[model samples]
Target: GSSGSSGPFNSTFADQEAELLGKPWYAGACDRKSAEEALHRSNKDGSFLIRKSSGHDSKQPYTLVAFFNKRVYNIPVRFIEATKQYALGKKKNGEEYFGSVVEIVNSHQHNPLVLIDSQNNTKDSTRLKYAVKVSSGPSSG
Candidate 1:
C-alpha cells in the first residue's frame, strides 16, 4: 500500500518585472493585471492561466506574510482617521482637529526598503516602493 500526496502542489512563479517600477513611492498608475500576468509567467510555463480566488482555506484574522530571500519587507497601509476631511468625524471648538483624514502607515515590522542595484567607481542606487491591498472573503463580517 502507498500513501497519497497532500497539500497544494501546483506551484507557479511568474516574473513581475514591472513591479520594480516607481520605487519608494506609491504609484497608483501601475498595471496590476499585467503584473499578475508576469508573475504567472515567472512561476510556471506560459501555458497556465492565472485566476483569482475568492476564499482562503485558513482561519479568521489571517496574517499573510510575504518574504524575499528569507526576509520580511515593510508594506504600506492607507487608512482614514477622524481628523481629516475624508475621515469618520469632525473637529470641535477652536482646535485643529483631524476629524477625517487619510494617512499612510508602515505596518511591517521589518524594513521594506531593498537596494535594487549598486555600482562601484560611480554613484548608483535603486530602491523599491511598498503598498498593501486587503481582500475580503465571502463570509467576511
Candidate 2:
C-alpha cells in the first residue's frame, strides 16, 4: 500500500538467503551477519524505495532498528498504517496475519519498536510465534 501515491507501491521484494524483518521494510535480521547487504539489495534497483512528493523541501527518509537502520528514503506514516492494515486485514487460507506495537525500555529513555509478527499471532502469550528473548520494545513507523 503506497497510500495510493504515485510510486512503486506494489513492488515485490524478496531474498532467498537473508529475510526482511518487516513491511514498509526494516531490519529484524536479514542474513546471519551485516544486515546492510540484504537491505541494500532490495533497494538497489533505485525505485524500490519511495516517498511522498512535497514538491519542495527535502523529504524525510524511513529505516529500521531505531538504533543501524539506515536512512535513505523516508516512508510516509500512511505507508505504515496502510501496510499494517493490509497485513492484519486478510488471510490467504483461514490463517490471518498480524503485527505488534511494542515499547522497549532502557535505563533512561524508551524506544517504540514495532515487531510485525512475520506470521499469524507473533507475540501471543500462549502460542509464542518467535522465541523473543531478553529485551523488549512500539508503533512501527
Candidate 3:
C-alpha cells in the first residue's frame, strides 16, 4: 500500500523525526543512556546526535546530545511559535530560526552552540562537527 502524504502538517514528534531520518545526525530511537555511550565511544569532542527526548506532547520533543570538553550535555530543542520553526533556544537579535532539524545541524557545523543557563549565564559550548551514524547491530534483539 502506498503511504499518503496528504495529511495535515505534522506538529507531532514522529513527523519531526521522519523529517530528520535522512540526516546522519538523527539517532534512531535511542535512549539517553545509550546516546551517552555513543558519544563517549567516539572519544572526540564536538561529537553529537539528535535524539528523541522523553515523553510526548511536551515543550521539548527533541534533544541535542553532545560530547564537549569531556562531558556529555543534553540540550532540548523546542518549537518556536513566533517564527513557526524549531530552535534550540529563543531567538536572540541576530540568531537565525531553523525551519527544520537539519537546518540547525547545518548551521551549527559552522557556528558554535552556546548553552545559556537559567541565570542568564553562558555554559558549556561546542561546535557540532561530527555526526554519529546510526548503528545497525541492534537488529539481534
Candidate 4:
C-alpha cells in the first residue's frame, strides 16, 4: 500500500467532518423542513440536530436546528477559517470559538444563546437541552 499527496489529508474542517460523521445528531443533507420535522417529533423544547445547510445564500456548510417555544430556529454554524474553529453567532469576540460542532453543541447545552428570528432579530434565549437522534434501520446480512 502507498499514499502520497502534496498536502495534508486533514484540516479543521476535516477534523470536524470526521467527528460529525460518527455522531447520531449529525443528520445528513436534509433540508430545513425535514430538520424541523425531526426536531419537533420529540415534542420537547430545546430538541436540536445538526444538518448540512441546504441551497440558499448560506456560504456556510452546516446548520444547527433547534425547537423552542413551539418554533424552530435555524442557526447557521460558521467555520472561522482564520482561527480554524466553528462558531454559532456573530459574537466571535466572546471567545466562543470551538474546534468542532460537537463542542459547540455541548457547550450550549447549559449556556444559553440568543434566539433570533428570520429577520435576524433576537427575541429570546435558549439552550440546547436535548439532541434529536437521527438513525437508520438495521441492516440484514
Model 3: pairs clashing at backbone N, Cα or C within 3 Å: none
Per-model C-alpha lDDT, please?
0.24, 0.25, 0.71, 0.70
Per-residue C-alpha lDDT of model 1 across residues 16-107, encoded as one tens digit per residue: 21432332322223343533333343332111111221132111101111223323322212112222122111222542222211111122
TM-score of 3: 0.72
For model 1, the run of ten residues with the poorest summed lDDT: 57-66
Best by lDDT: 3
- How many pairs in model 1 have backbone atoms within 3 A of each other, for residues 3 or more apart or on separate chains, i.e. clashes? 21
Candidate 1, superposed: residue stretches over 4 Å from native: 1-21, 24-27, 38-78, 84-105, 109-141
State every prediction's TM-score relative to the real structure.
0.21, 0.18, 0.72, 0.72
Once superposed on the true structure, which residue ranges of model 2 sit more than 4 Å away at CA? 1-3, 7-33, 36-91, 99-141
lDDT by residue (1-141, candidate 2, tens digit) is 233344545332212112333323233332323333443444432212111223321111122221112312222221124344212112346422223222111211222223333553333111112111111145433
Query: Compared with the true structure, what per-residue lDDT tens digits does model 4 show for residues 49-80?
Result: 88876533123768887778677787788766
For model 4, what is the C-alpha lDDT against the true structure? 0.70
Listing every candidate in turn, what is its Cα RMSD in Å to the true structure after a full C-alpha superposition? 18.2, 15.8, 5.6, 5.9
